[PDB]
């Protein structure tokens, strides 16, 4: 299929995951029944988007304005988007960065994020939730990793945070290539993370959080293991991979949802397509549902393209037309020969 369809499907998938997943954010238990009724309610209010989409748009705006990654422009756009519309459900950690970036004396736009958590940086998934645009703008894996890291570091300075951003960007990147045997898709991601998590900073950051290094790599191994199981309960998936705000407790989970939902689920009606199945499933894990779903939706939209974006769901989402234009513009500016 055509890259323009993947570009449009990628940002549509992200919007859908955020908008559809939002009502369940932070809920520790979400039944599949509940999520099915929620999505079936879109096939007779608008579903408003949250911080995930707001930041996705600001990231894309910066790339489009500059035709390149520009850290100063992007940092300022994040701050100004928050100032403009702060009630979108931003996390408590990131607001401190935005206030510091709005300081008229701020000259190093990475400094506020570095200062988070007593100089250790945040390890939340806010860098990852918005990173899809990077993978749409940059086609080399080298650039994807570099600008995924840099964009993430404007708010999430811990390697535990920015490495989750890189992982997500790489997942979206592989999906855009249409890569994909499931086995090879995982292998490649596992390979990149094994290398990135072997750097001194990665090891130091995990250690000083108490985790047994290579949190992404050990979880991507677990994803494979889970995928080799005939049946895994939702509770088992959450126990092994997580469903939280920590990037290591959401990005691998997003990836498992994507890979798992390439095949049917016995409790998800076959009337739903693969993109739909992925989002219902991911939301049914509970926890950080808007963000896990927005990330799974990004990867899935990139892989399945606009043909699996349901009209009834899409047209229920706030800003779906604006989202589509941003996707097309990224393709025009960065991907078109």
Query: Exposed, middle or buried by CB within 10 Å (0-12, 13-18, 19+), for 26?
Result: exposed
Closest separation in Å from C-beta 53 to Mg ion: 8
Instruction: Please report whether residue 253 would count as binding Mg ion according to CB under 5 A.
Output: no
Instruction: Please report whether residue 81 would count as binding Mg ion according to CB under 5 A.
Output: no
What is the C-alpha to C-alpha distance for residues 291 and 52, in angstroms, rounded to an integer? 7
Instruction: Please report whether residue 188 would count as binding Mg ion according to CB under 5 A.
Output: no
Q: Is 89 annotated as a binding residue?
A: no
Q: Is 29 annotated as a binding residue?
A: no
Cα-based distances in Å from 82 to 57, 189, 224, 337: 12, 32, 38, 35
Total of residues contacting Mg ion (CB under 5 A): 7
Instruction: Please report whether residue 288 would count as binding Mg ion according to CB under 5 A.
Output: yes
Segment 195 to 234, residues that bind Mg ion, using CB under 5 A: none
Q: Is 125 annotated as a binding residue?
A: yes
Closest separation in Å from C-beta 201 to Mg ion: 26
Instruction: Please report whether residue 50 would count as binding Mg ion according to CB under 5 A.
Output: yes
Contact status, residue 89 vs residue 25, Cβ threshold 8 Å: yes
Q: Could you give the 3-state DSSP secondary structure of residue 268? A: coil
Contact status, residue 157 vs residue 223, Cβ threshold 8 Å: no
Element (H, E) at 316: none
Contact status, residue 16 vs residue 297, Cβ threshold 8 Å: yes
Instruction: Please report whether residue 52 would count as binding Mg ion according to CB under 5 A.
Output: yes
Q: Kindly indicate which of the ranges 81-89, 137-145, 269-277, 328-336 contains the residues binding Mg ion, using the contact rule CB under 5 A.
A: 81-89
Q: Is 24 annotated as a binding residue?
A: no
Closest CA to 110 of 149, 167, 80: 149
Q: Which of 81, 205, 249, 290 binds Mg ion (CB under 5 A)?
A: 290
Instruction: Please report whether residue 53 would count as binding Mg ion according to CB under 5 A.
Output: no
Tell me the CA end-to-end span of the chain in Å, nearest whole number.
Answer: 17
Q: Which of 145, 158, 282, 291 binds Mg ion (CB under 5 A)?
A: 291
Segment 83 to 122, residues that bind Mg ion, using CB under 5 A: 89
Contact status, residue 24 vs residue 294, Cβ threshold 8 Å: no
Which residues bind to Mg ion, rule: CB under 5 A? 50-52, 89, 288, 290-291
Give the annotated binding-site residues. 25, 50-52, 120-126, 156, 209, 245, 288, 290-291
């Amino acid at each position: 299929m055509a890259s323009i369809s993947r570009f449009r499907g990628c940002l549509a998938g992200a919007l859908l995951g955020d908008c559809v997943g939002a009502v369940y954010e932070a809920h520790d238990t979400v039944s599949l029944a509940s999520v099915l009724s929620h999505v079936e309610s879109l096939e007779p209010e608008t579903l408003y988007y949250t911080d995930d989409t707001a930041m996705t748009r600001a990231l894309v705006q910066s790339l489009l304005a500059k035709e390149a990654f520009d850290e100063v422009d992007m940092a300022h756009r994040f701050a100004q988007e928050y100032k403009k519309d702060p009630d979108r459900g931003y996390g408590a950690g990131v607001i401190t960065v935005f206030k510091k970036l709005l300081n008229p004396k701020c000259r190093d736009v990475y400094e506020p994020a570095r200062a988070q958590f007593n100089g250790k940086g945040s390890y939340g998934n806010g860098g990852a939730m918005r990173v899809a645009g990077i993978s749409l703008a940059y086609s080399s894996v080298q650039d994807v990793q570099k600008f995924a890291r840099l964009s993430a570091q404007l708010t999430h300075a811990s390697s535990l945070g920015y490495n989750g951003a890189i992982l997500q960007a790489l997942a979206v990147h592989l999906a855009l290539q249409g890569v994909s045997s499931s086995e090879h898709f995982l292998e490649q991601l596992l390979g990149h993370m094994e290398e990135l998590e072997g750097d001194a900073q990665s090891v130091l950051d995990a250690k000083e959080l108490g985790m047994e290094e290579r949190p992404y790599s050990s979880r991507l191994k677990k994803v494979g293991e889970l995928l080799d199981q005939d049946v895994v309960s939702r509770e088992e998936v959450v126990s092994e991979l997580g469903n939280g705000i920590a990037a290591f407790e959401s990005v691998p989970t997003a990836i498992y949802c994507f890979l798992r939902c390439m095949e049917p689920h016995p409790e998800i009606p076959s009337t739903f397509n693969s993109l739909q199945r992925t989002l219902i499933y991911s939301i049914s894990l509970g926890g950080d549902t808007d963000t896990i779903a927005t990330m799974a939706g990004a990867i899935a939209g990139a892989y399945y393209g606009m043909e699996q974006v349901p009209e009834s769901w899409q047209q229920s989402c706030e800003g779906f037309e604006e989202t589509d234009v941003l996707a097309q513009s990224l393709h025009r500016v960065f991907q078109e020969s």
